[model samples]
Target: SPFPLTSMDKAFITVLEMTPVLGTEIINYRDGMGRVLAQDVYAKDNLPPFPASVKDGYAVRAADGPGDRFIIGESQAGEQPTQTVMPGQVMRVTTGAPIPCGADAVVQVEDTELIRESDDGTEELEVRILVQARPGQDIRPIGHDIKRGECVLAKGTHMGPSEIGLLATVGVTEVEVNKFPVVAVMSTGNELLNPEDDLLPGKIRDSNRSTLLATIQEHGYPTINLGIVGDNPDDLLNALNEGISRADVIITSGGVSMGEKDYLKQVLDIDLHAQIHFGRVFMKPGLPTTFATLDIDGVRKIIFALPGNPVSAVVTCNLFVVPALRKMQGILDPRPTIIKARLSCDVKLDPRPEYHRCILTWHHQEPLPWAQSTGSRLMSMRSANGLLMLPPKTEQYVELHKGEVVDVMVIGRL
Candidate 1:
């Protein structure tokens, strides 16, 4: 008999334990986006580093508001003003310009009509205030954005554009980040052909290769496309040999099931002596999912053998492969963020746990988002951003009612 299938939670926890993957490297922060931090990023100096103007206005002592004020000087972005504003006087300050010392308030240009302008508008500029100015109004105090010696990003944080911008703000030119693991992708089956080749009788296009390559690269990991190979054991072994030699992870579709041509398990065990951690999973659309790890040349290379169906391959990729890649790349909390959402359609439970693809909708008036199924079409997933899960023990004929709150795994963080 086949081995009892592993539960989804156990499968998830088993893979999550394979952490601290690969190694770390130092690279320019510009190239560090999408990579995970291996070091804590610190703010070398305070953001702004000085009190700054939050608007283009007249910087003045609050007591001077609602009164005509003389422009002692002008301050634009990037320049420091030597002129100081005293009682009944103000400095013309532009947005993002440093606030002149001794000014505690700023009266907006809209509130004051310009009375005069210098040949270039400076010391001679005049304005009549039309509104009251409160102390500290419109002034950004020093360290208001970021304090000195504060942690900008903790280790293991995924670096995106905003994080990279913050790193640059803190004067970081380079960063130490976990290197992305190399992923090798291949497709198996004698009926598969290169997408460019003419389709002969009984031949199908090799879409799994393209899909695997694109999905693995979606989050920035480098992929080695091994192309399509037949069901021959010798060719599969050769590809596995090359995969184990060059890649940190090998992902393949087909050939892991109980079909006569399925020989991936045979080659892994009999030829290369690789360990099959789990051969089957207890879930819908991905029940044949397989995971293995091999120790090659003092390094462990993970192998994900996804199922043969297009829907199964894509669904399992989001569930398993993405998390493994995130973990290997040094991301902490590397799992799909699951949230509760109410269902808009009736859903039938499967004998095995099911991950039903659904589109999440949020309305201005609706406090809770609603999830609607993408229907049963192969491409229905195009509109899906989440999965509505049903328990394995749920009876097949019993349908989950509409308005029922279900746990949704947000997949289309796409």
Candidate 2:
């Protein structure tokens, strides 16, 4: 490695500090889900806009209870009743309807019995109260849900279903959302081929391109497929330059190690004059992983040079690229959630720290969750949700036994 290998902790901090800051755009609130808020959302006016009734009931004065009360007027949603409730009178009101001007409380329809009604039974003429009325019973005041000038949704908040509903409640039709990072993905090698093409001697099919594209899209970022590049320095530089033009981040697989075909690093370092932040990390399956940043036409774009191995590509992308995307979008809790789990079997420690992929399962009869390695074979990673962080081997502790506790980072819902 040309540069000293960065540890996992320091590498993460460096990546975040290097990521480009994205701008914001105003969009309809309906399209704001999965986007971060660029500014605080203040209520334009009070929610409910008036003192409203929360149930189908009668708006009445608190003193007008435990006796017969004359019906003065009717109040339904979307109508402003002209009559103010008098001391001995109550007005019929429906749920979400504004309480009459002079009413201080509401008694549910279930709490009152109709003493008299119009001939058509369409209007309540008189009613008897069955319960005492509290001053604000069943009434939602003007600012019950939101107050004018109060920040309803703060900056950097992730807009979810509840936040969207809150914005609508406060009559906000649009909001400023942080723009998602645009990513470009490609694979670098002369021996790479598409599945459709015949695999001739000394050739392998390209899987990293599709895998990285889906990975970026799965986490809610726009991605561009830059296709495959060969070992030629000019073609590699051309692809990198194109990626910078079309995307905020570019990720390339292979050509990072020290070999005859490994020309990606040289092109990035010498041809383009890009700053290689970290050439390696002290981690297994991805020690050759490289991270760089370049300024293109005054905007800095990040580049992830991942290892060629299939397992290494998957693991490094999850551990690094995903978190970097989250930070760029202004997510508050961007890091992967790490929790403790019990090992289901013995695991030997590696010389370098290992990010071991595993399957996590919970049994109702057991207290803590159990974890098992996904195994060494490059099989389908369909259900590997948790990443076991195994410490480097030491003289005293070379291996972990069954039922031992370890920290596992949860990358998927399972």
Candidate 3:
């Protein structure tokens, strides 16, 4: 008797039970985007490092009243003020300029009248205050952005532009980020042909290569396409061996379903000396997904054997491959961020868990509708910004309400 397929949760848990293989490499900060941090990052010094003015204004004692007159001193960004600001004196300062000592507030330049000295230096300039300011107005205090010895960033944080800028703000010249795991993708099917070659009568273009390659790149990992292998078991065995040898992980699409030529599972058991923990998952389109691990050259490597259908391949990849890749990259919380949205159209569900193919558009806080209902997994008509996740055993239900929130799998667009 076949094992019950509803144990996908347990199967995935068992898959994740396998330990991750850690790898490290040095990378420049410029190339560290999208990589995970390998170590904690601490601020070397306080951000701003000094009290700076946030506006182009006159630095003066906040105690000064409206219409007060004083002598005008000098100040600008990167240059020090010549004179300290007294009770009746002001220093002309620009935005980002260091505040002069003894000044507690900044009055906007528009709110003050500047009097320049004559060339002969015979006339004393007068500074007129048009608006009275309180203490500390328009002044950026030292260490406002970051304090000394602060934890600027933590390990396992995914690096992005904002994170990089924060590191730079704290005077971090270099960063230690996790090295991306290498993924080797191979597609196996006699009916599949390369896209560059003309398709014959019974052949389809090998799209798994492009899809898997693009996905690997999008996830910030290095990918090597092993191309398509024929239906022969020996050819697939050779490809699998080579792929495992070159990459930290291997992914192969097609030849996993119950067909006469379904050699993926058999080859893994026979030639590769691999363990197939879960041969099937209880999900529509991806029921034939297979998870396996093998010891190649005394090193263990994870592998995912996916179905041939485009939607099935993508769905299973998201469920299994993406998480495995993230885990291998040292991500602590690698699960997809799930959101809720309303169904745009009526949808039926299988007796078992199924992933429906549809386009989910934003309608306020909920998703608008599920578009293109041919139900054949039409890649051309499958333009979806997200996937509407319909649970198992759902019966009659009209259009989901506009404001109702349902679980959604976001992809492609925001």
Winner by lDDT: 2
**Candidate 2, residues 1-414: lDDT per residue as tens digits?**
466888877787888888866888899999887899988889989887889999898999997666899998889899988898988899999999999988999899999999998899897899999999888999999999878989988998888999999888888888888788999998988999986788899999999888878878888799998998998999999999899889899999998888878887789899989999888889997988889999867888899999988889988999889988988787876888888899989988988888878888787988789888886343354678888988899999999999999999887777
Q: In terms of TM-score, which candidate is stronger, 2 or 3?
A: 2
- How much is the lDDT of residue 229 in candidate 3? 96
Candidate 1 lDDT, 1-414, residue by residue in tens: 254699999988887786337699999999987888899989989877878889888898987658787888888888887877888888988888889888888878888888887687544567888888888899888999999999989987888899988888999888899889899999999999998999999999989888778878877889898888789889998998888778889999998888888888878778878877788899998888888888766778898888878778888888899898888888777887888889887777777889877888786898788888775454463567887777765434567889988888887763
Clash number for candidate 1:
0
lDDT of 1: 0.84
- Pairs with backbone N, CA or C atoms under 3 Å apart (clashes), candidate 3: 341-406, 344-369
Q: Write the per-residue lDDT of candidate 3 for residues 219-259, one digit (tens) a residue.
A: 67899889999998999999998988798888999998778
Clashes of each: 0, 0, 2
**TM-score for candidate 2:** 0.93
Q: Give the TM-score of candidate 3.
A: 0.87
